[PDB]
């Protein structure tokens, strides 16, 4: 029932957000088997070393931890513009 909404609409939204100016990193090559993020650090001979990606654990921003169960509301209690019958 919802598949046409994800493929035929949400995917285009991904395609555009894919080009927004501040989405600067490459996140995933589409290959779980091989992909690793490119890893840069600011660093100086004077001893500074700041990794851009680092694993400090759960943080106040509320973005460090993922609840995968978000899939369930998406597959069930969520309507879409493409389902349903018209909607601009």
């Amino acid at each position: 029932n919802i598949a046409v909404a994800h493929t035929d609409h949400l995917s285009v939204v991904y395609a555009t957000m894919s080009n927004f100016m501040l989405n600067f990193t490459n996140n995933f090559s589409g290959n779980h088997a091989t992909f690793k993020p490119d890893q840069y650090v600011i660093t100086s001979p004077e001893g500074s070393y700041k990794p851009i990606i680092e694993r400090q654990g759960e943080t106040v921003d509320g973005l460090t931890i993922i609840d995968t169960s978000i899939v369930w509301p998406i597959l069930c209690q969520c309507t879409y513009p493409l389902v349903r019958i018209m909607e601009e």
Binding site: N1, A3, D8, R84, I85
Partner: protein, 49 residues
Amino acid sequence: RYHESVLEIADIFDQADFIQTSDAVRQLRALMPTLSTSQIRHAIERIAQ
């Protein structure tokens, strides 16, 4: 060097009571918009109505 394209089952199979494949039904399909299962369901509900 290739061309990806859609292959309708009607363009493979042609068993008589299984897959309707009259050229009529074919061109009638050619007239149709892309469809979701919900669209098809809505059509069925409309004929029912």
